[model samples]
Target chain A: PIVQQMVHQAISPRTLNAWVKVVEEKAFSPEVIPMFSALSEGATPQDLNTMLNTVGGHQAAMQMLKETINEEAAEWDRLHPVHAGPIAPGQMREPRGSDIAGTTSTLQEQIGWMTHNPPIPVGEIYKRWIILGLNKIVRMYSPTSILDIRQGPKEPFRDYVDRFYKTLRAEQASQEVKNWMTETLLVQNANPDCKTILKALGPGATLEEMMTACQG
Target chain B: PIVQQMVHQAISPRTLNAWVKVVEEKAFSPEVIPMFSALSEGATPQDLNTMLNTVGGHQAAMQMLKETINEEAAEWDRLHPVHAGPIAPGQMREPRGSDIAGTTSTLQEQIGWMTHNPPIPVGEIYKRWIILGLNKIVRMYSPTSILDIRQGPKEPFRDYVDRFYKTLRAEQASQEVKNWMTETLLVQNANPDCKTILKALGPGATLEEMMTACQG
Candidate 1:
């Protein structure tokens, strides 16, 4: 009795009314209506026996319910396309030459564009949406990203030099940017004692010469 | 004329002798042998015209040469399978349950095993060989791999603590091994001043408690 109630509750009032119309027009037994509704709601054949035994339906009625459920499921699937789950890295396309200027679209805007477009398939636009989301989080090097190397009060000259080179090696910027940053910003930020020692090495001194003079 | 000599040189002496035998048996033009030999060696169709023009061969002769080259190339391929360049990361199989202990096969031994096995196809064994070669270079962490952290003469307690944690974090060992290693080997290896301070914190003290005592 509880199983019969579960089958009844799964089908909406409008859907039950439509099933009633089908039963009346086809001149089938009234028992067929509930059984058909249960099948459409994904209830197993074991759940059918409780309602079928109470009303006493034949094999022909059960066959008709099976055929009707298949047709309705097909119609539902046709109207609503299923998603292909999360987009893979291979599916995401790199920005083309023409797309470079307008590639600044936010992740939310990219998702909205994919959902709204009909002529352009949802599958094609979904990949571009994934790429835009990834671009926001991906690491991009900037000149300011490199931190200044300040020697601690008790730090050895060799230890300070090691930290300076370690910081320089970790930066992902171009050699030209690194060279200018090292020459102007980094050298200027050193401790007073270190700066004075490097200055005594003269104007044309190389980075190696400055390091040697400071370590001396 | 130089191109013709280059083509002749590309075909080995043994292969040329075999081609001479085919010419006599088939009652074909001797030029057909050289042209077919050139095609088998990956010479262009343009190269065929030089020999064809000199010998004055018909379309039927040229057609025969093309057919012969195709059969010979297929036979050569069957005898000597071409390697699929460098093995990609995807192609390397992870060691199975049974392969754990004996996974210590060297790169050279793996290559030899792949070459010797005929019943087992080379393609399947080649993938296994690649995994073996990669196993040699892939990093396997050991307890001895963690370096002793010796505090520098002028090193601040905070800097020494910073270096200790940095060294610990870089190790790829299990947490249990790292804990034991930190408690036993590492604490014993610290500088005399650092050791005396940590020792004053008393036995069974937490790493954090010892660090606080040393930094005090």
Candidate 2:
């Protein structure tokens, strides 16, 4: 009943997938988790399910794990806010343009340092958000948002096109999608090379080849 | 006179250094960029300097260049906001995690294609910011900031140590700084291996060695 309360309360987006998988598998219930040792006592999922079904069925167990894990993860996130310890202000400093490494050598070393030891779980998104800016955080972690970036005047023509391709490609967009968006966007921008480049993109040309042609 | 005006006005951060070098060399006025034809016409540096000195001299030229470049960059940024192309919401679809890789690969292909062509001047910061993220952009472009990133909870221990070294190494922080911070942070975290690891870190133990000891 305590765990039932825990299950009902465990709600956070971070571990939603984990909870989903638990439900789909109809895995062990919170009360039954202790019974994991019961396997050595010659028990099985069947024995536990038969015993605890009165408390709730598989549905109840599944919901319990979700709430438990969700609460723990949320608590962990709260207690260990992203900017704790070394990353706290005065410890970690703001990045400047010059800090960009030509190779990941420095970054590799830095990331390596951040990844091991106690093994904190810094997601790729969190890392990017901390190191890069909001734009990168959004672009890298939130894949669904990639397509929203466009060419800025200051951006090189090739870079913009590349981003365009990358965003659509991440979507696993069909050639039809790639072509339609590419053509539609190019036409909208109406750069002089739009027609010439589109001509090169005819049918069989790859995004690479079309980009090459755009460089002309 | 046209060139003097051109030189005076040919300012923008991207092209600022180019103009500075030209003025330092007291190089050609705008119209005579190649300067070959002008040399053929027997226009000496003395001739040009004497003629153009009244147009506010080199100081005036520098001022004009700064003003001109600043205005253009500002105008360009305004006219072409960062999302100028296909990224318009109606055009590009929202991103999802799966799209992250596709976008990178596509962007890579485009960057490669662009490099092989006449090779426009792509600033490291710009490139990193677009493809990698702010963290990389800053670290790559501004080496100074590399050492400032300390350890964070989200960061792995190995990564924290590496960042520790990279920052110290970048700053050329003395061995004392290195040993002190590494020892302090590790000890503060109080891993079971702290004492053993610190002993193993004896004197000049590199971050790598310290990490291995911690692992042990």
Candidate 3:
């Protein structure tokens, strides 16, 4: 009951330090004073008695104190988790719908999700699931400079396009535009990797053919 | 001229051999004869002619033949790949709509996915992605009866569970059944090396907690 009362209350650091001082200054038999002296800033009277009475009691008491401190620190930490900085993988919180951001603290959070929780085997969480593909040949054939996209090194070309096409199902772009841009980029990214994969498929292999080839 | 016609078509292996014999027997200049003879079963006469005058004709012809054989074999292998065996990470095909199975070729394919692809520092293919904590004591536990589900000494606890969860999913195990079964097996599999990980979260920590801890 005394130990419960001693540990349960949210005592001030000052009160804790005073208790530590009293425990430290207690007159033990001179034989165990050396061990008692070695105890750090926090020691209980019970711990002092335990160490004084047994051969290895000092070690046991110290271990107990360490565990108690850890339990208390853990409780404190549980109430206040660290936020807005690096988090190791698996520890990452689920990405939020509100996590969408072009740039800001919101961007930081989105980047966190992308870095920590990306699609597997094919790594990367593409923003807007946009894929530029390889060969930024500038789309000079277009009236304006169309963004000739190349995905980052984080994901393979095949996976990037898979995610890209999934987002395109909303049909944001025109049929011709999707067809043309998809063809341009597909050939850019897909041609080399899928070249070997598709050469066996035959020349003039459609985009579907290339997807099938690469998928397999 | 006969050598030209002989080597031109996609000859049978037997036919190709006979053609090699004919080319070797023909009386050409003594200078070109040695290089021509070195050309093997698949060599076209045009290939032989191309190599004949080159300074390193013998080596060139041999290299060409080796490459030709490899190309043909590769094409054949592509057409008929060996199914039902080990596949490396990233090579797994997406799970299909027709993929439902508890045991069949579809089961085989699901097993293939589990064996081949897994989440790692890697990133995810798993949605909901609830990672069960280490030490799912449900194998009902042990006094040496505990089955320590350590992945092969090489793979990590995180990846092993990732694979396990994927397999369980493919089985279409019920959600409640999955949760309980997963809890037991998860901790059982989780015990041993990841004891510290299990300890930090305590017994009832959610799948997400386990995932986050293990991810780190």
Q: For model 2 chain B, where is the 10-residue window of minimal lDDT?
A: B5-14
Query: Candidate 3 on A15-110: residue-level lDDT in tens?
Result: 334324433543221112222222211222222223333333234444443444344435534654546667577664533222221111243343
DockQ of each model vs. true complex: 0.02, 0.01, 0.01
lDDT of candidate 2 over B14-128, digit per residue (tens): 2222332444464322222333223212222222222222121232122222233333445544654443246654323322221221222232232332243343222221222
* Model 3 lDDT per residue over B5-52, tens place: 121222122322333334445322222333334332233222222222
What would you estimate as the lDDT of candidate 3? 0.36
The lDDT for every candidate, in the order shown, is: 0.39, 0.35, 0.36
Between candidates 1 and 2, name the one with more favorable TM-score. Answer: 1
Where does candidate 1 chain A have its weakest 10-residue lDDT segment?
A1-10
How do these models rank on DockQ, best leading?
Answer: 1, 3, 2
lDDT for B192 (candidate 3): 57
Worst 10 residues of 3 chain B by lDDT: B126-135
Residue-level lDDT for B209 in candidate 1:
85
Docking class of 3: incorrect
Give the Å error, residue B11, model 1.
58
TM-score of 3: 0.19
How does residue A140 of candidate 3 score in lDDT?
13
